[PDB]
RNA sequence: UUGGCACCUCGAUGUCGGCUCAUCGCAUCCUGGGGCUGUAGUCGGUCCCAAGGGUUGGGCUGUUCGCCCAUUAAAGCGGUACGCGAGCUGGGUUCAGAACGUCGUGAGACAGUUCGGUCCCUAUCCGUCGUGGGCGUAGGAAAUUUGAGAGGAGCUGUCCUUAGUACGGGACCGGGAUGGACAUACCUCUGGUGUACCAGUUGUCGUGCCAACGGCAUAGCUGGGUAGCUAUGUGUGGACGGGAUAAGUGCUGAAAGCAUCUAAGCAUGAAGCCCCCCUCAAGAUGAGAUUUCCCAACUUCGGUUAUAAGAUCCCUCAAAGAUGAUGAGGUUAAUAGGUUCGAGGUGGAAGCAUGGUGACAUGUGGAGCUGACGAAUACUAAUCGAUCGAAGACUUAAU
């Protein structure tokens, strides 16, 4: 349930370390968003170097959330903290590596590139 | 077409094809017998009366709606059946495929049939304007004295009155609701029960009517 | 929040139409002579 | 439980090849993953931390640490997507719900075997 | 259940008092609402007395108060002893019932329907 | 809109913005039809028809204003005492205190700037939202006809098949399902609450000491949690076609031997549309409605009689409930309470035995306890009663 003014931890090596949700794309009136949703955020904490600097407006996709999504078979899967990955414009990762597990709901969102770099996919 | 009366038991879940969970509602419907056949040359509209639950017959001093005689008895004596508890009418089914005294079974429905459930709601009694209608409350702090209360109810001098339907507090509950486009998961003839995919309106042990969706 | 006009004897007597008491059960006794309330403890204990 | 119909119309959906286990035990579920057209079997090793429900609505939860992040799964007890379950360790707890393992991390979240 | 216009603790205290007073004289007179709440509390106490095991004794001491009944020939005994004594012997073939309610007339001070609860 | 006039109110018509809640318009922001372009395809200049619904979150200036950030199919202009303070705030304007600058001989003034500063009322009448009593129909119980009334209606994005060929990037054309917002029903699932459920633990008081237990400390605190109530949770909806229609495109065709959508006529054509369709309450003193079934001695039917799963009164209750009303029951009885089981919840009782120097293990034992959920069983209580009670008349036709 990621909404406005929500701080997430980046899960890649793009330079960013912490971002803050600015808007949830999907339609007028949209309040919250879950795994497999694109959102506009700003870098609040970056590491020395990288391609992304502090105070930058970029687009990212959620991959992990405290409140897990529900499957169609009646199964659930919640994580321990919220995380996202700074993507490009053609749903392409801006980094080169991913850290931690990744949800299997990104396969239906045409995110092969991001799902083919995740160490685990459950 | 294909009408029947049943009682709401409870709510469970059933796994369908490809291991997909499906929440269903157990509806028990038995002892369904036609009682009359309204024609268009005697009433002006075709319909058929159907009973549901049974009850005890002849009884003298009985100050309770459960067992006696006279009025209801006679009307139920017309056809070969015993006194019924609930009675309804259906003007969507054919009046040429039934006979006064027929036994409406649950074999008329088949898995994968779209039906429309109908019944009264539960009831929350006297409710406020924040529960009856989806209204927002005022600031809970910042020196505010406006909480779960309604706002303005009109304008000013011009039209100095309240228009009909101002959405104010009142009793909310007992209402006839009709869910459309449902589904029959599986039908059982052993216990004469029907599994509807979803949830019908009304509380436990309540009367519900089923009809083939027109759309 | 204050009456705009005084109430008349007609309107005042019209509002006191349902304001009254109702006669009780009063079940007869089999051996006492006096009456008693229904489902009560006495010589009748109802009827 | 009023009448015996709800348990009679759902007695053909219960399984009988499921082993007995209690909260605090380490299990190895064999979920049947269905991708494009190929069907594979993914194993999920964890420790039961919950067990509520009754009848055909019984459910259980298993917690595990992937790559430094805690993951929790929850599938219906009588689900047809579960190939087979096998207990590999019997823990010793003192409660029915271990919700204190969500804050613990490292050697502090270690369960002693009976 | 009923709350009898009292607090959780206050209500719990009153219930214990009534129960103990209905085992001392076995014939008390109070209001109807309170008579329909102490009827399902003194019935559970008698059930414990029928058992006669040590466990029940400790379970029956978590509700009964500490009073001293005076019988004939200067004989004294605590309510607990009386509950596991004659009372237990009296009801040994009857499964259920025990107490009985008898409706009466209204009070003078206020219009409260008073009743009489006694053991059969 | 800024003004002009001074007709109502000075024994008071007391308030700028914001909050909550609304209704109505059309000079149309979005969606729908069209027409013409100095209108390459996309796309859009303008014009005509069209009001049914829908029209976002923040930062800041003091804010009505405005400027910016990011979205959206779109972030339209107005009216109702510049809608709404006996519905809310008091920031602004603002009253007694106090500074700064200019002006004044001075008390002080300034459409200068700044910090601080009490917003009163028990709803009589109409109106509105719910809910009953009394009579009326010439009626006792059910089941209904209903066009009078209310509600709801047309938003997006991909997939993929004549080819991404016309046009010179990217079109209107029938037609399974995925979403956003909103509406409605429900508790199987994920959660929340759960003060008469179970367990752990601190201080103190009381039954000689210690225990067990009880009282008080916010429920003493902490970890879980049944029924019920619930959203962030689970379902469904908004489709569909039908009839006239608007702008408009036409086909025939005539009071200038041509022409011409026209004066007759025949078509086609919108989120048009109120119509129809769908959902809900509904006998309408325009005494109305309809069908099925049940009910007789008094005594000239004057009611002297009275009967009807005909009504109560009273009593046990909850799928109902402010009170009444509605529903489940009253001994030929499972309505409530017990009592014996069961489901779920807690998580291993007491006693006994063993192990250990001791705090503590372990076994007998998924043990013991368990409010609201359920089944079985008359053990307690719903006991002898009493009261109140359909319509059938006239006149005048056809039988």
């Amino acid at each position: 349930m990621i909404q406005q003014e929500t701080r997430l931890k980046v899960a890649d090596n793009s330079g960013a370390r912490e971002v803050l949700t600015i808007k949830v794309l999907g339609g007028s009136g949209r309040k919250t968003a879950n795994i497999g949703d694109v959102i506009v955020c700003t870098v609040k904490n970056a590491t020395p170097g990288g391609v992304v600097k502090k105070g930058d407006v970029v687009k990212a996709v959620i991959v992990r959330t405290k409140s897990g999504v529900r499957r169609n078979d009646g199964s659930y899967i919640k994580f321990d903290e919220n995380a996202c990955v700074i993507i490009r414009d053609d749903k392409g990762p801006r980094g080169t590596r991913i850290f931690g597990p990744v949800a299997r709901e990104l396969r239906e969102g045409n995110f092969m590139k991001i799902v083919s770099l995740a160490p685990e996919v459950l | 077409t294909k009408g029947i009366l049943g009682r709401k038991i409870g709510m469970t879940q059933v796994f369908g094809e490809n291991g997909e969970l499906i929440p269903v509602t157990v509806v028990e419907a038995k002892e369904n017998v036609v009682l009359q056949k309204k024609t268009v040359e005697v009433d002006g509209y075709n319909a058929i009366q159907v009973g549901f639950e049974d009850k005890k017959a002849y009884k003298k001093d009985a100050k309770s709606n459960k067992y006696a005689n006279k009025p209801a008895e006679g009307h139920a004596k017309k056809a070969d059946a015993a006194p019924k508890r609930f009675i309804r009418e259906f003007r969507n089914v054919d009046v040429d495929a039934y006979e006064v005294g027929q036994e409406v079974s649950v074999d008329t429905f088949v898995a994968g049939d779209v039906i429309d459930v109908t019944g009264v709601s539960k009831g929350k009694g006297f409710q406020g304007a924040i529960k009856r209608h989806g209204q927002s409350r005022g600031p809970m702090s910042h020196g505010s004295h406006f909480h779960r209360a309604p706002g303005s109810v009109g304008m000013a001098s011009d039209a100095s009155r309240v228009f009909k339907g101002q959405k104010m507090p009142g009793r909310m509950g007992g209402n006839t609701v009709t869910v459309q486009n449902l589904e029959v998961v599986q039908v059982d003839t052993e216990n004469k029960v029907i599994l509807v995919k979803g949830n019908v309106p009304g509380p436990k042990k309540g009367l519900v009517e089923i009809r083939t969706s027109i759309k | 929040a204050v009456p705009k006009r005084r109430t008349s004897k007609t309107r005042k007597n019209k509002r006191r139409t349902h304001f009254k008491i109702s006669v009780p059960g009063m079940t007869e006794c089999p051996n006492c002579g006096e009456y008693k309330l229904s489902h009560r403890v006495c010589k009748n204990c109802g009827s | 439980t009023n009448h015996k119909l709800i348990e009679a119309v759902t007695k053909s959906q219960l399984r009988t090849d499921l082993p007995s286990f209690r909260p605090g035990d380490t299990l190895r579920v064999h979920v049947r993953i269905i991708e494009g057209t190929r069907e594979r079997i993914q194993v999920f090793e964890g420790v039961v931390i919950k067990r509520r429900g009754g009848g055909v609505s019984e459910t259980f939860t298993v917690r595990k640490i992937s790559s430094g992040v805690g993951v929790e799964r929850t599938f219906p007890l009588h689900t047809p997507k579960i190939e087979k379950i096998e207990v590999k360790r019997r823990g010793k707890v003192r409660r029915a719900k271990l919700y204190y393992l969500r804050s613990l991390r490292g050697k502090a979240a270690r369960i002693q075997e009976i | 259940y009923r709350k009898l216009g009292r607090t959780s603790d206050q209500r719990k205290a009153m219930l214990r008092d009534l129960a103990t007073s209905l085992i001392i004289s076995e014939r008390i007179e109070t209001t109807e609402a309170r008579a329909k709440e102490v009827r399902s509390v003194v019935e559970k106490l008698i059930t414990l007395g029928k058992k006669g095991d040590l466990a029940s004794r400790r379970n029956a001491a978590k509700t009964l108060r500490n009073v001293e009944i005076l019988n004939e020939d200067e004989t004294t005994q605590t309510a607990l002893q009386k509950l596991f004594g004659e009372i237990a012997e009296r009801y040994t073939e009857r499964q259920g019932g025990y107490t009985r309610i008898l409706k009466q007339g209204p009070r003078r001070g206020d219009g409260a329907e008073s009743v009489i609860i006694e053991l059969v």
Side-chain angles (χ1 to χ4, degrees), chain A, chain B, chain C residues 1-30 33 35-41 46, chain D residues 1-34 36 40-104 106 108-109 111-114, chain E residues 1-16 18-72 75-112 114-117 119-120:
Chain A
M1 283 215 196
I2 305 341
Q3 59 181 55
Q4 199 181 110
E5 309 271 319
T6 290
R7 293 167 165 258
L8 311 102
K9 155 198 347 306
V10 200
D12 69 12
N13 63 345
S14 47
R17 260 221 320 281
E18 177 124 338
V19 307
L20 175 131
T21 320
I22 281 180
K23 179 79 26 154
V24 172
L25 336 156
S28 148
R30 243 219 135 120
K31 280 327 179 128
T32 88
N34 228 316
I35 305 173
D37 296 337
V38 184
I39 49 104
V40 176
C41 46
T42 166
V43 189
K44 276 294 192 224
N45 209 337
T47 93
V51 305
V52 188
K53 322 312 272 178
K54 207 184 98 170
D56 277 359
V57 169
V58 304
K59 273 170 184 202
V61 57
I62 309 177
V63 297
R64 295 195 305 261
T65 36
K66 300 250 1 210
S67 72
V69 301
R70 163 205 228 244
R71 309 298 191 90
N72 87 332
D73 42 280
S75 304
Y76 299 80
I77 184 202
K78 331 178 159 341
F79 292 83
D80 243 296
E81 94 300 17
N82 336 277
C84 62
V85 175
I86 313 226
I87 75 190
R88 218 176 335 262
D89 54 33
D90 57 53
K91 306 153 133 223
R94 204 88 91 65
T96 35
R97 291 148 53 44
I98 314 299
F99 312 127
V102 128
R104 179 187 286 306
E105 267 70 0
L106 297 179
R107 212 188 273 294
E108 300 75 347
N110 218 38
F111 286 117
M112 327 325 312
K113 257 327 309 220
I114 281 192
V115 86
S116 91
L117 262 69
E120 277 186 78
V121 171
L122 31 53
Chain B
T1 150
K2 271 159 229 354
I4 203 194
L5 293 177
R7 237 205 230 276
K8 181 166 136 154
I9 297 319
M11 252 199 104
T12 340
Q13 64 181 7
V14 141
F15 308 87
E17 268 359 298
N18 321 94
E20 72 165 318
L21 195 74
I22 286 163
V24 312
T25 300
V26 182
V27 156
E28 188 213 37
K30 53 160 165 74
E31 320 174 355
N32 276 214
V33 172
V34 183
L35 284 191
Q36 209 183 311
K37 272 189 42 151
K38 310 285 202 88
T39 72
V40 44
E41 316 89 342
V42 168
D43 304 310
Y45 77 101
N46 319 293
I48 50 147
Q49 256 193 12
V50 178
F52 180 20
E53 214 112 280
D54 275 11
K55 30 213 294 208
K56 337 315 234 346
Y58 274 55
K59 182 85 183 254
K60 257 322 289 317
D61 302 348
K63 47 243 169 127
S64 149
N65 164 17
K66 201 234 246 118
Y67 46 7
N69 27 62
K70 291 15 272 249
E73 191 88 50
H75 168 268
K77 239 213 37 70
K78 261 318 246 346
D80 240 323
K84 263 4 143 133
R85 189 63 152 261
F86 302 99
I87 289 160
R88 290 299 181 263
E89 278 196 10
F90 301 87
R91 354 185 359 207
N92 57 317
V93 322
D94 197 344
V95 60
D96 297 296
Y98 290 111
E99 265 89 13
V100 169
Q102 231 189 48
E103 158 82 15
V104 170
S105 92
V106 320
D107 312 294
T108 69
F109 289 114
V110 295
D113 265 19
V114 197
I115 45 125
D116 289 346
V117 193
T118 289
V120 202
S121 314
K122 303 181 86 134
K124 340 296 210 157
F126 206 111
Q127 270 334 321
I130 293 256
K131 202 182 209 47
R132 210 150 167 249
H133 323 277
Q135 297 211 353
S136 330
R137 345 156 274 152
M140 273 306 112
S141 85
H142 286 115
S144 148
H145 287 90
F146 184 77
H147 302 327
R148 358 189 0 112
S152 43
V153 295
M155 284 79 101
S157 278
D158 251 21
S160 50
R161 43 162 198 137
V162 187
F163 298 136
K164 299 216 133 83
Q166 186 34 30
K167 284 177 175 355
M168 281 165 183
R171 166 170 320 178
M172 126 222 215
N175 283 321
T176 297
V177 194
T178 280
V179 189
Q180 295 177 303
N181 293 353
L182 270 213
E183 192 161 324
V184 174
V185 168
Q186 119 199 12
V187 62
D188 174 305
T189 92
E190 295 67 24
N191 323 81
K192 322 143 154 357
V193 310
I194 310 192
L195 264 31
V196 205
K197 153 186 182 20
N199 42 49
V200 315
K204 288 213 226 341
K205 311 178 322 213
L207 166 72
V208 297
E209 324 165 19
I210 314 210
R211 287 182 244 239
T212 287
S213 98
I214 34 221
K215 324 173 141 174
Chain C
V2 310
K4 185 74 167 174
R5 301 240 2 111
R6 99 211 194 129
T7 303
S8 45
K9 318 209 242 185
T10 301
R11 195 181 293 281
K12 159 183 88 154
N13 283 328
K14 259 172 183 201
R15 185 184 54 239
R16 310 189 169 147
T17 309
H18 304 287
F19 185 72
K20 65 157 101 148
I21 333 201
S22 30
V23 50
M26 168 240 340
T27 189
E28 188 46 288
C29 184
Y35 266 115
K36 203 213 23 117
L37 272 160
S38 267
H39 308 58
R40 252 60 196 184
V41 69
Chain D
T1 296
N2 199 267
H3 249 338
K4 315 66 222 162
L5 281 181
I6 286 203
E7 67 81 13
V9 300
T10 60
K11 133 145 345 308
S12 61
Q13 302 254 75
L14 301 209
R15 309 244 289 184
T16 57
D17 51 349
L18 285 193
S20 152
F21 58 81
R22 299 176 152 176
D25 299 337
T26 309
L27 308 194
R28 280 177 54 78
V29 191
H30 283 258
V31 193
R32 216 204 313 293
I33 288 322
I34 284 291
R40 4 177 343 239
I41 307 287
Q42 204 185 250
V43 179
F44 189 104
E45 188 157 304
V47 21
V48 178
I49 69 157
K50 198 182 175 151
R51 244 210 111 156
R52 72 164 288 305
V56 57
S57 311
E58 272 229 47
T59 56
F60 70 96
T61 302
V62 298
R63 188 207 180 52
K64 94 124 116 162
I65 311 260
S66 63
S67 330
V69 190
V71 189
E72 298 191 8
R73 287 285 266 133
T74 279
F75 2 53
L77 191 29
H78 313 278
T79 191
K81 284 211 135 27
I82 275 174
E83 187 207 59
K84 57 129 172 28
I85 313 174
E86 73 202 15
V87 178
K88 82 175 285 271
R89 258 284 292 317
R90 305 226 162 249
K92 144 68 154 327
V93 290
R94 295 293 305 286
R95 27 206 73 269
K97 316 268 204 280
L98 329 183
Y99 289 152
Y100 64 80
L101 288 191
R102 295 219 201 99
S103 329
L104 291 218
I111 315 291
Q112 22 160 324
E113 180 272 351
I114 53 136
Chain E
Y1 44 90
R2 290 202 195 44
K3 301 207 220 139
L4 312 162
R6 288 276 207 304
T7 325
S8 48
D9 39 342
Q10 313 203 0
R11 171 172 359 109
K12 158 149 170 163
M14 186 194 318
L15 279 200
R16 287 179 65 186
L18 278 173
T20 307
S21 288
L22 171 45
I23 277 171
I24 285 345
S25 43
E26 320 130 342
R27 180 171 251 266
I28 65 151
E29 132 178 32
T30 183
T31 89
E32 179 172 71
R34 312 225 209 87
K36 288 193 164 137
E37 280 316 334
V38 63
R39 116 184 113 157
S40 100
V41 150
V42 66
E43 254 187 50
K44 282 199 214 304
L45 274 211
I46 282 152
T47 282
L48 274 193
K50 271 170 89 126
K51 237 134 270 197
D53 96 326
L54 185 70
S56 314
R57 290 196 92 97
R58 304 196 145 133
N59 274 358
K62 292 161 89 169
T63 296
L64 234 33
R65 293 227 160 277
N66 260 290
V67 299
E68 296 275 344
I69 313 163
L70 183 33
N71 328 106
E72 289 44 86
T75 314
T76 181
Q77 59 163 347
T78 87
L80 195 62
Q81 275 159 358
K82 161 145 172 191
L83 168 62
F84 276 71
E86 32 178 307
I87 296 235
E89 315 313 355
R90 188 190 316 198
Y91 315 120
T92 178
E93 282 108 357
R94 183 194 299 274
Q95 324 140 8
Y98 311 148
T99 90
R100 139 160 55 222
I101 308 216
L102 299 174
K103 284 224 211 3
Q104 301 231 307
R107 277 219 289 236
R108 201 221 164 215
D110 42 25
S114 60
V115 300
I116 298 245
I117 175 114
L119 306 164
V120 312

